[PDB]
Structures are given as structure tokens and as C-alpha cells.
Design a protein around this ligand. Structure first.
Ligand SMILES: Cc1cc(C)c(S(=O)(=O)NC[C@H]2O[C@@H](C)[C@@H](O)[C@@H](O)[C@@H]2O)c(C)c1
Ligand SMILES: Cc1cc(C)c(S(=O)(=O)NC[C@H]2O[C@@H](C)[C@@H](O)[C@@H](O)[C@@H]2O)c(C)c1
Ligand SMILES: Cc1cc(C)c(S(=O)(=O)NC[C@H]2O[C@@H](C)[C@@H](O)[C@@H](O)[C@@H]2O)c(C)c1
Ligand SMILES: [Ca+2]
Ligand SMILES: [Ca+2]
Ligand SMILES: [Ca+2]
Ligand SMILES: [Ca+2]
Ligand SMILES: [Ca+2]
Ligand SMILES: [Ca+2]
Ligand SMILES: [Ca+2]
Lengths: 114, 114, 114, 114
């Protein structure tokens, strides 16, 4: 299945934060309605935050996360969870190798803000 | 129901990250096995990270999040989600007197690391 | 926090299914835009299905689950999870007593159908 | 990633229930510690329940869901969600074609029971 794609409400501010847990340098591309709006690049094996930004979901509300390491696309896993019918988390794990921890880059998208 | 309490595997490194979205200064207390091991204090209305740490779940694996503002306990909501039977997120929202949204402090716990 | 309330897309068919795990007779009321549209009643300590129906979310998309035993409201926990940005589950547990298994009536709402 | 695989606590009773939403006849196989222990077969485009059973997770706790249509494996999506640190849902969607609704067979695993 396609993973790492989420529908947000239109024209909504959201947070995106990426963590790294891999010997590989992670490149996380964030697209809003099919256009790159942020790229986070970093390396950590201890969950360092490699990027955190506030963005807007735009007219179409489409947010997509892609992850690569040295030009190779990582395999993604994702889900969205909603608490109290209002607090939203869109969650991405990614795997750059064979141990299948899916923590090599982790991305958390949260809304609403404010 | 009690919220903000999670059972982790024993002796496991985990990340804890807190974001703020409130006029009130948030105090986030992290307890591991019934002892405070981290306190994040900060304030933002635009999803600033008010703390990010790597902790260990210890012998018992018990992790509890409490949130207060000006000494008053915020109301919590929480859940845990597991992706690919291995990537874990424990999620907490909190609501203070100032804004009736569970985003006033948002806490994300993630494991495994490395 | 209020639990058991979910916003569905408007005018959308959804499934609602309730299971029982309690000595007490469970009553599950399903309300769509603040009107009861189905009630499931039954008793089981072995996860029997006490009702399953297809409903429509109507104009407003508001779906609320209420659980009671002999007129006493149970304590509810809930969340919504979305897979592949398309398959939705709204989940409710309920506790009618003191053991805190939260499974006394369990309700699963799923969409889309077809 | 390998979807539809979940680690349950050992020797635990759990419910498994499957719904169908497809023109194709769905076969759901449930494996506990690498042995098939239940099989549900049916066809519906309106979320009919094609099976529900109570099973035990055994010593290993490994539960796997496979879905096929005329012997062709469907593509799976899955996640596990825990409410109140105690009430567990393991959730599977499946796609038998390319419209990507992931509802063609929907499987819900719940525990604890009783
Ligand atoms: C730069 C580099 C080196 C290596 C060895 C790899 S890898 O082994 O294919 N994967 C990275 C690997 O890093 C470990 C520290 C651990 O976090 C694993 O889960 C992770 O997959 C890569 C990709 C890059
Ligand atoms: C205060 C209270 C309420 C109820 C409903 C009961 S009961 O119905 O007799 N027992 C509910 C109880 O049933 C067990 C078999 C188990 O499933 C529990 O999780 C469930 O709460 C009593 C006795 C008291
Ligand atoms: C590759 C492929 C497989 C299948 C099983 C079919 S089908 O059975 O003719 N149609 C499956 C299809 O049914 C629709 C009513 C809808 O529920 C779809 O989501 C579902 O996938 C085809 C045509 C092709
Ligand atoms: Ca890895
Ligand atoms: Ca890793
Ligand atoms: Ca707020
Ligand atoms: Ca109970
Ligand atoms: Ca019970
Ligand atoms: Ca389909
Ligand atoms: Ca379908």
C-alpha cells in the first residue's frame, strides 16, 4: 500500500518533526499538494530531532512524507490516530535496511496548533 | 479512565518529546516507575518543542505523563499505536483552563531507538 | 475528555458492531447527528456480537456511542485510527464495574463500505 | 513491511472478526504460532460479517492474518492500538484489486475477553 500520505483539513497549520535512529544519513522530504515544502537531513542513532517545522496544508490538504538514504528510497509504514475527536497525529516509520525496526527515520505530524 | 500511563518493555530506551500550544506555561512531568525523571517547562502558541530527551523504562517499564499549568492539573487523553508490530508511539494530549483543546501540551513517546 | 464521539465524512455508509464481555446486560446506543438510530442489547462473557448494522452518517457526520448497563452509564475510552489514508476505524471500550478491563461492551465502527 | 502480524500476550483469549466489502469472495486465514486455527470465507459488498471466533494466543503469542481471493494474496495494511493501557485492538485492511479502498476484507482482533 502507499504509505506516508495524509489528508489534512484544508489551509491548516500543522507541525512536522523528524527523528533519526540509524547509521545512515536520513533525507526526509515533506510535500504539500505534490510540492516539496521542507527537507530535513540528518544523522543520529539516538533519536535526535533532525527537523521540526510549522507548515500549512494548503488548499488540497495533501501531506506526503518521503524518506531516502544516499538516494535510495526507504520503505515506509504509517497511520493516523485521532484522540478526543480533535487531536491528530500522522505517524511515519521508515526502514533503510533489513532489521525492520522502522525507526531509521521517524516522522510525527501534529495538528491542530495554537 | 486513567490516561497518560503506558507499559513499555523493561530496560528500554525511549524518546519523549513535548510540544506546546497554549498561552499558559506548561509543566510536563515524566515519571518512570513512579519517580519523576524529567520535567519540561515551556511556553508557546506555535508548537515549539519544550523538551526532548532519551530515557530508559527501567525495571518496571512504567511511564506516566502528567501536565500542569500554574499548578493546576490538565485533563489528559492518550493512546498507544504500534506499526509493523515493532514501532511504538505513546501519545498524550492535554487541556488546560486557557484553551479547551487537547493540544495545549502534546507529548510523543517513541521506541525503539538506535 | 468526552469519549465515543467521532466525526465521519458526511452522508457516508458505515458499519457499527458491538461485542460483549461482562456478566451485565449491555446497551449500546448509536446516535447520528444527535439522534438515536440503533440500539444493541445483549449479554455475553465470551465476546458475542450483540449487534452489527450498516448506517449513514447523515449531513453532519456526527456519530456518538453511549454504553449503559441497566440505566447506569459505563465509563468509555475511544480513539480513531486511519490506515492507508482511507480505511477508518473508530473504536470504543467501556467499563461497567471496577476491574478496569474496559471490554464490557466493545464497539467498532468501520468505513468505507462497498 | 510485513503487515497483519501481531504479538499478543501469551496464553490469552482473543476475538477475531472479519467483514467483507468486495465483489470477490474473501478467504481470511488466522494463524496462531504458525498454525492455521480459523478460516472465514464469504462475500458481501455491505460489510457482512463473514466470521467471528474466540481463539487463544498460545505460548508464543504470534497472530497472523492472511487474506486471499481465489488464492491470490490481498495486499494488507495493519496496526495495533491500545486504549487505557489495557484494551487492545489489532486491525487489518486488505485490498484485492487496485481501487485501494483496503476494505475488501476487514479484520478486527480484540483482547482481553471476559
Ligand atoms: C551509512 C550506512 C551504514 C549502514 C551499515 C547502513 S545499513 O546497515 O543498511 N542500515 C542502517 C542501520 O543503522 C543501524 C545503526 C540501525 O539503526 C539499523 O536499524 C539501521 O537500519 C546504512 C543504511 C547506512
Ligand atoms: C457495579 C457492578 C456492575 C455490574 C455490571 C456488575 S455485573 O454485571 O454483575 N459484572 C460485570 C463484570 O462481569 C465480569 C464477568 C467481568 O466481565 C467484568 O469485567 C465485568 O465488569 C457488578 C457485579 C457490579
Ligand atoms: C485483480 C482483481 C481482483 C478482484 C477480486 C476483482 S473483483 O472481485 O471483480 N472486484 C473486487 C472489487 O469489488 C468492488 C465492488 C469494490 O469493493 C472493490 O474495492 C473491490 O476491490 C477485480 C475486478 C480485479
Ligand atoms: Ca533499520
Ligand atoms: Ca534503526
Ligand atoms: Ca491550545
Ligand atoms: Ca469490566
Ligand atoms: Ca469484562
Ligand atoms: Ca478494493
Ligand atoms: Ca471494497
Amino acid at each position: 500500500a502507499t504509505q506516508g500520505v495524509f489528508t489534512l483539513p484544508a489551509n491548516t497549520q500543522f507541525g512536522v518533526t523528524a527523528f533519526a535512529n540509524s547509521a545512515g544519513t536520513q533525507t526526509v522530504n515533506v510535500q504539500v499538494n505534490n510540492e516539496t515544502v521542507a527537507t530535513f537531513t540528518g544523522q543520529s542513532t539516538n533519536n535526535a530531532i533532525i527537523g521540526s517545522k510549522v507548515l500549512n496544508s494548503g488548499g488540497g490538504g495533501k501531506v506526503q512524507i518521503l524518506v531516502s538514504v544516499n538516494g535510495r528510497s526507504s520503505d515506509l509504514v504509517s497511520a493516523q490516530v485521532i484522540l478526543a475527536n480533535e487531536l491528530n497525529f500522522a505517524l511515519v516509520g521508515s526502514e533503510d535496511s533489513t532489521d525492520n525496526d522502522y525507526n531509521d527515520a521517524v516522522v510525527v505530524i501534529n495538528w491542530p496548533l495554537g
